[PDB]
Amino acid sequence: DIDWYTSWYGLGMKPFEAKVQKDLIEPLDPKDIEIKPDGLIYLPEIKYRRILNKAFGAGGWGLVPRSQTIVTSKLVTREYGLICHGQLISVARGEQDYFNEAGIPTATEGCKSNALMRCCKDLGVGSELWDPVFIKKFKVDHCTEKFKIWLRKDRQVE
């Protein structure tokens, strides 16, 4: 049994079976990838959990908080660590903006999922989201600009 709020068990101590690693590094479908109005591309946070459930399984992974939450005058932030298949994988800080005091609690879920994608970096899940070769190819094959902001070829203005 492990105190996952402070422990580091299993970190780096062995890799998963080849089947798991294959499922972790499998390429993304370009249909799943989004883009902000100012052009930053991203993968929605439920897609990471779908890949995690595919690779390890439900109940085969989980986040733990690793700190107190800090509430600044504009932002909510906290560290979370990612357990997978019985060993710690990563730790990352997460963030979320909030615009009035009633949002301070709701931002916590944004914070948690924001930490999740960061902890997914160290698994290689969706690695091509971070690769400039992929980013600037994607912005040509699958996106466009309108009056000035960015959109996909199958989305509309809001």
Segment 9 to 38, residues that bind a copy of itself, using CB under 8 A: 9, 11-16, 20-21, 24-25, 31-32, 34
**Total residues in contact with a copy of itself, by rule CB under 8 A:** 72
Q: Residues 13, 87: contact at Cβ < 8 Å?
A: yes
In whole angstroms, how close is the CB of 44 to a copy of itself at the nearest point?
6
71 binds a copy of itself (CB under 8 A): no
Structure tokens at 35: 């883009």
Q: Which listed residue (41, 90, 138, 143) binds a copy of itself by CB under 8 A?
A: 90
Q: Provide the 10 A C-beta neighbour count for residue 29.
A: 8
Interhelix angle 45-55/18-25, nearest 10 degrees: 160
Q: Which of 30, 67, 130, 146 binds a copy of itself (CB under 8 A)?
A: 130
Q: Which residues contact residue 92 at a Cβ distance below 8 angstroms, ignoring those fewer than 6 apart?
A: 79, 80, 81, 82, 115, 118, 119, 121
44 is a contact residue toward a copy of itself (CB under 8 A): yes
Q: Is 153 in the site for a copy of itself (CB under 8 A)?
A: no
Instruction: Identify which of residues 132 and 147 has a Cβ nearer to a copy of itself in the complex.
Output: 132
